[PDB]
């Protein structure tokens, strides 16, 4: 029925009519195919797949059915199956734009960005007005720092979003990507609101009543029940940030429930949150959103915490159901939900100043310092102290770190203190330098093991990922990364997609002011590297001024930031987890806070750390800060010493203090509701 | 050192010298890269990866290091990493042929055969004399039934192999693929011998002594210790064939040891072999070949059984070590090892007649009927009996099967017997036909559940894979597959790569003789379908004479063979597992045994079954057999009835009898050795 096709929005209604169309005429390919497409929207993947196959049985060359089948296969995680279907659709009709675009997205998912780019271009050739394809292409070009026609692209993106938002359609720019593009705050917020709307619509079709919520603390013996919901209890940045928090919650006043949206990945991160939460519930076992929300309700949750927003593995359908009376966005998602069902965003003054409450659909709930936290002190305590070898004295050329470093140092005939232990060039120092020059894995000095920082996965693969603290003394050096012994190292360790033409221009300016210096970047992904290098050269900078390294295992990545002098933050979207990483190594970060939450996190970190001289108000300042730290060597020593001492003395990496403040804010939110008020700003 | 590079074959020696080259000159990219390449040949993947990264650190645009790194990444199963490296190599040098060929093989592995084809062509454009690339291209073209320039290709393949075998190099045609190409038996055997040689060379470098082997049965209380070694104790054809065999071994005379080369995949196949073997050992935990062979030795194995040959997951290094005195190829590998370390091939008279003992490097050890066995009786007992609906009487249009079929039939007012129960067209019969026409999942008749054969994974996903017997009555019909109600169905359910131009020509001839008939093929893979259809049309056959279906779940695949009249076997390489599948459904198979073991298995199955009238001596016979079974309807009924009754009464699917014969042959082999003779032919 051309009817059922039209019931756009009334899903179960469309379903019931396609069924009837097949009651009149069983042999109806198009009705099978459409029935499959709507069963797929309802998440009935096996049933969908069955009707697509029926559709193809009737019409063996039905391109559109194969291309839609491939989507279903991709949801079922049969990726090769998906490929087979898309390819088949393109064989049947080589001018089918959607099939080419579906294929491209398979390539993007496997990180084959050049093959994705080429297929999105074919789709665009065939159908020049194709928003989803243009916007996805734009994300691929972003990922690899392909800035061909950059300014047109940005305007072209803004326009598509304008067109779409007017027409009430869900926009082709993903809310998580929306921070990279010069959209208005109203646009960003509205993109987010749309995605939040689709969550209501998927759950409205189960016609559940509202849940009724607890109003006292009595059923819970006076404890606030907090539920943390996340697809990232496992080897993920989220756990690298907050894995200690559940177990530090005061059990006299709080009862902690962790709701995992992902199965157990076997890592110590998942182990720790499982062991330390009062309750751990694996919602990855309970795929129906109604049941899962029911569980949440019957646990008696007072505050449910959304750690995903619009990131991989989200199930915001559960928050749409309102299983709890207070619902707050917490740390995994650097932006607004736009969704009426989220009451608060846990943030801070520096990140989200009360001026810009309008960027956000939620009420602002402030932590007193930064809302950012890091598990560095617990994951990487071997980085609390370091020693150097002297080959007059550099803090960042040849570094040793280790739980047992002090006793190693004490076994040495001569060591001086400047506090920083220095090892002079004796046999020991040459044995070390030799191990590194040879690429050898480790040596023994005085019974201690001395490890090559490059070989951590061979010595202890759990120490490499940060799931265990290393039990050897590790040596880290500038020559392991081809970095110069005799010049300033500026670093940035973020994915390349965070860089834009203005940012690379600022860096270029800084490197021209500081002739004796290099910028240290990562292959994140390696296919972005010749673009950056090409753009740098057209800005008039020689080949050797930008040094690339590969992405490293978690512990090596954090340990190696000790080799840099200064980190240059990306103003487009800052280091978040990666800002904590660089600061834990004692390396100052220069930043320029923007308008969005994502552009402002590093300034919040640095404010919490007590380094306000590192925050720029504009581009000229950012350059001047950075040139100053690469030329005024005594002021570099001061600022470095300030970072090294405040990573410990400040609140920044203090998970216990963080948890206690968080608790104080949960209670403020609770009391303001217990007394029948509705969500308002907490300060 | 240009030296170390030259130590071709003396692996640890090359290693030790590259190390020394780095002792003289630490900063030597090429030496890092070569050192990595040899560490990789020794299986030291993490160490290899470290030195590749060192090589790239010194020379950021070292294309060759990136391309070799990608291979290492691919061995570590970091597939995206591998892609990144190959792509990077091609960005740096777009004329690097090997990098393009490495990329193509990544595409082939993911089943993206058109993208693999295109990249192997680029490699061939850049380097026209590139054997590995040409031969891999040839396999891709095979897989999709791309027969462009077919005859030249075959001669081009033979020549490459001739060139290579002379020059002592390991050939670019994989021994498992060698059966598809018109090579001589001496060529095939020699290809296999080469791969067997590389296994000795990898284990020779551990300079182990010979093992010394038991000579009596005394340490084992009079029991022959048999070790079955396989990467396929899990959801694999091998387990679908032999999973019952270990537990049926006579524990008074045999002690069974299963050596898994793969981790536990969670399936009931793995569960059953684990539970029923006297001992189960997970060699996937013990990656070093020396240790694993040691374990085998200290278990006291008298006969070690190689179930892999040259198939995925093989570790023939363990057989090269000779941990046991008798070593036999058994069922997973349809050809010779060519390897001096394998004593026997368990085969039979029909498959491997004593005339052709020369095809084989091993001695022939004969099972008395076929060496082929199938677990069908145990996996699919619901297929032992069936009923039909009559909409005068067909056995293969509308079929019901079920453990509880008999009691369902007994609840019906009218049923006639012809033995075959027939259901007449009443309400019941229309309720069934209606369920199917609507694509509905199931209905209840008289309290029994009646399931749509298309919806098995929705009802019971373990029944669909064959890990459980279905607990409902399943309905299977020709209209579920678009097959004609009023004409002969010829089927072949093998992967398309088994078909060649001569085979499709024979089928075409048969379909022209039998106007009222269709050939039923599978999308295996779907990208092969328009080729077959194109070639059929150039042979003068309309669009509708060849019907494609998708690959089905294991149980549906075996159940649906009941809908065919006749199966047309592929003479190039026959149905093996798939021949057992089709016979279990009661469907006669027409075959033409060739020269190779792989071309002869179906004739052995059919001889064991007692259907000699189905075996053709040449092409004319094969056509005539097949036309005869599609036109002489009374003789089709006879031959079908003969297949249906002999799948039970003959040895073919009789796992207990098979195991007892196997035991009788193990003892013949043992006694002939106990008495210090060396391997000779057993009959």
């Amino acid at each position: 029925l051309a009817n059922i096709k039209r019931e756009q929005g009334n899903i179960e209604e469309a379903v019931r009519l396609y069924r009837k169309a097949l009651e009149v005429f069983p042999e109806f390919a198009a009705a099978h195919s459409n029935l499959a497409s709507v069963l797929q929207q309802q998440g009935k993947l096996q049933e969908a797949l069955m009707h697509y196959k029926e559709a193809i049985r009737i019409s063996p060359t039905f391109a559109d059915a194969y291309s839609n089948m491939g989507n279903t296969l991709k949801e079922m995680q049969d990726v090769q199956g998906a490929l087979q279907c898309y390819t088949r659709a393109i064989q049947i009709n080589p001018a089918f734009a959607d099939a080419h675009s579906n294929l491209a997205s398979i390539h993007k998912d496997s990180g084959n960005i050049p093959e994705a780019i080429a297929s999105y271009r074919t789709a665009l050739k065939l159908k020049p007005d194709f928003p989803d394809a243009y916007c996805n292409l734009a994300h691929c070009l972003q990922i690899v720092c392909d800035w061909t026609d950059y300014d047109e692209r940005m305007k072209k993106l803004v326009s598509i979003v304008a067109d779409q938002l007017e027409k009430n359609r869900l926009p082709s720019v993903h809310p998580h990507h929306s921070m990279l593009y010069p959209l208005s705050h109203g646009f960003r917020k509205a993109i987010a609101e749309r995605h939040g709307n689709l969550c209501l619509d998927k759950i409205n079709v189960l016609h559940k009543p509202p849940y009724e919520h607890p109003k006292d603390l009595k059923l819970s013996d006076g404890r606030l029940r907090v539920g943390y919901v996340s697809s990232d209890f496992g080897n993920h940045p989220t756990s690298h940030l907050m894995q200690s928090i559940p177990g530090m919650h005061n059990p006299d006043k709080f009862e902690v429930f962790c709701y995992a949206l992902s199965p157990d990945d076997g890592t110590n991160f998942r182990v720790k949150v499982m062991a330390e939460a009062n309750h751990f519930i694996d919602l990855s076992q309970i795929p129906c959103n109604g049941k899962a929300a029911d569980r949440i309700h019957q646990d008696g949750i007072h505050i449910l915490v959304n750690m995903n927003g619009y990131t991989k593995g989200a199930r915001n359908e559960l928050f749409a159901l309102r299983p709890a009376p207070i619902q707050a966005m917490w740390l995994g998602y650097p932006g607004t939900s736009g969704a009426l069902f989220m009451d608060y965003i846990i943030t801070d003054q520096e990140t989200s100043p009360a001026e810009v409450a309008e960027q956000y659909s939620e009420k602002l709930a402030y932590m007193p310092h930064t809302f950012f936290i890091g598990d560095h002190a617990n994951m990487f305590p071997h980085l609390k102290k370091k020693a150097v070898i002297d080959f007059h004295i550099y803090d960042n050329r040849i570094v040793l770190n280790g739980i047992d470093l002090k006793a190693f140092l004490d076994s040495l005939p001569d060591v001086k203190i400047v506090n920083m232990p220095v090892i002079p060039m004796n046999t020991i120092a040459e044995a070390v330098i030799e191990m590194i020059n040879r690429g050898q894995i480790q040596i023994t000095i005085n019974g201690f093991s001395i490890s090559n920082g490059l070989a951590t996965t061979q010595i202890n693969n759990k120490a490499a990922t940060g799931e265990e603290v290393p039990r050897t003394i590790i040596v880290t050096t500038r020559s392991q990364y081809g970095l110069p012994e005799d010049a300033i190292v500026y670093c940035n360790f973020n994915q390349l997609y965070k860089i834009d033409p203005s940012t690379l221009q600022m860096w270029a300016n800084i490197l021209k002011r500081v002739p004796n210096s290099v910028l240290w970047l990562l292959r994140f992904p390696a296919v972005g590297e010749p673009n950056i290098q090409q753009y740098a050269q057209n800005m008039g900078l020689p080949q050797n001024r930008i040094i690339f390294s590969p992405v490293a295992p978690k512990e090596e990545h954090v340990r190696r930031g000790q080799l840099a002098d200064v980190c240059l933050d990306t103003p487009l979207c800052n280091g978040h987890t990666t800002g904590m990483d660089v600061l834990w190594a004692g390396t100052p970060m220069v930043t320029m806070p923007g308008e969005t939450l994502a552009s402002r996190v590093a300034a919040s970190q640095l404010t919490c750390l007590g380094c306000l001289e590192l925050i720029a108000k504009n581009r000229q300042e950012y350059e001047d800060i950075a040139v100053k730290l690469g030329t005024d060597l005594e002021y570099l020593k001061k600022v470095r010493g300030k970072v090294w001492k405040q990573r410990i003395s400040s609140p920044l990496f203090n998970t216990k203090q963080y948890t206690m403040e968080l608790e104080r804010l949960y209670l403020q939110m609770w009391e303001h509701y217990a007394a029948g008020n509705k969500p308002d700003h907490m300060i | 050192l240009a030296n170390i590079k030259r130590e071709q074959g003396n692996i640890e020696e090359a290693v030790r010298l590259y190390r020394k080259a780095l002792e003289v000159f630490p900063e030597f990219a090429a030496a890092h890269s070569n050192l990595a390449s040899v560490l990789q040949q020794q299986g030291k993947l993490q160490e290899a990866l470290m030195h590749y990264k060192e090589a790239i650190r010194i020379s950021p645009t070292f294309a060759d290091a990136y391309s070799n790194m990608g291979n290492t990444l691919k061995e570590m199963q970091d597939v995206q990493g591998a892609l990144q490296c190959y792509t990077r190599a091609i960005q740096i040098n777009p004329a690097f042929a090997d990098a393009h060929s490495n990329l193509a093989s990544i595409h082939k592995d993911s089943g993206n055969i058109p993208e693999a084809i295109a990249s192997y062509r680029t490699a061939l454009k850049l380097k026209p004399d590139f054997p590995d690339a040409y031969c891999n291209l040839a396999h891709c073209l095979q897989i999709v039934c791309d027969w462009t320039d077919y005859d030249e290709r075959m001669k081009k393949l033979v020549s490459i192999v001739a060139d290579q075998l002379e020059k002592n190099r390991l050939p670019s045609v994989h021994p498992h693929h060698s059966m598809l190409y018109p090579l001589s038996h001496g060529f095939r055997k020699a290809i296999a011998e080469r791969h067997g040689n590389l296994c000795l060379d990898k284990i020779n470098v551990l300079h182990k002594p010979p093992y010394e082997h038991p000579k009596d049965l005394k340490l084992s209380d009079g029991r022959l210790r048999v070790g079955y070694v396989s990467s396929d104790f899990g959801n694999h054809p091998t387990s679908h064939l032999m999973q019952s065999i270990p537990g049926m071994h006579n524990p008074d005379k045999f002690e069974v040891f299963c050596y898994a080369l793969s981790p536990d995949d969670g399936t009931n196949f793995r569960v059953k072999v684990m539970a029923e073997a006297n001992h189960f050992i997970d060699l996937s935990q013990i990656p070093c070949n020396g240790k694993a062979a040691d374990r085998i030795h200290q278990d006291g194995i008298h006969i070690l059984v190689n179930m892999n040959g040259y198939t995925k997951g093989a570790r023939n290094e363990l057989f090269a070590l000779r941990p046991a005195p008798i070593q036999a190829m058994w069922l997973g590998y349809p050809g010779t090892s060519g390897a001096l370390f394998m004593d026997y091939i368990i085969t039979d008279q029909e498959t491997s007649p004593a005339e052709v003992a020369e095809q084989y490097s091993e001695k022939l050890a004969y099972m008395p009927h076929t060496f082929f066995i199938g677990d069908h009786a145990n996996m699919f007992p619901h297929l032992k009996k069936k009923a039909v609906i009559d909409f005068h009487i067909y056995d293969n249009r509308i079929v019901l099967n079920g453990i509880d079929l008999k009691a369902f039939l007994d609840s019906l007012p009218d049923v006639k017997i012809v033995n075959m129960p027939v259901i007449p067209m009443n309400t019941i019969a229309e309720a069934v036909i209606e369920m199917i026409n609507r694509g509905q999942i199931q209905i209840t008749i008289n309290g029994f559940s009646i399931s749509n054969g298309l919806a098995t994974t929705q009802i019971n996903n373990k029944a669909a894979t064959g890990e459980e017997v279905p607990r409902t009555i399943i309905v299977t019909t020709r209209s579920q597959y678009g097959l004609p109600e009023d004409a002969i169905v010829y089927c072949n359910f093998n992967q398309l790569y088994k078909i060649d131009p001569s085979t499709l020509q024979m089928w075409a001839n048969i379909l022209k003789r039998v106007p009222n008939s269709v050939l039923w093929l599978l999308r295996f893979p779907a990208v092969g379908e328009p080729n077959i259809q194109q070639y059929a049309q150039n042979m003068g056959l309309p669009q509708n004479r060849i019907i494609f279906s998708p690959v089905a779940p294991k149980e549906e695949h075996v159940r649906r063979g009941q809908l065919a009249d006749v199966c047309l076997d592929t003479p190039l390489c026959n149905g093996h597992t798939t021949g057992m599948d089709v016979l279990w459904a009661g469907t006669p198979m027409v075959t033409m045994p060739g020269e190779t073991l792989a071309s002869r298995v179906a004739a052995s199955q059919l001889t064991c079954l007692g259907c000699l009238e189905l075996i053709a001596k040449n092409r004319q016979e094969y056509e005539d057999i097949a036309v005869k079974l599609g036109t002489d309807l009374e003789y089709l009924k006879k031959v079908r009835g003969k297949v249906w009754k002999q799948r039970i009464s003959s040895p073919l699917f009789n796992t207990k009898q098979y195991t007892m014969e196997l035991e009788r042959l193990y003892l013949q082999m043992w006694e002939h050795y106990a008495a210090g003779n060396k391997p000779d032919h057993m009959i």
Binding site: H176, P237, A552 | D78, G81
Partner: peptide, 12 residues
């Protein structure tokens, strides 16, 4: 990273 995987934050 080359050799395994570096999980990151990314869109749903």
């Amino acid at each position: 990273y080359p050799g395994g995987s570096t999980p990151v934050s990314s869109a749903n």
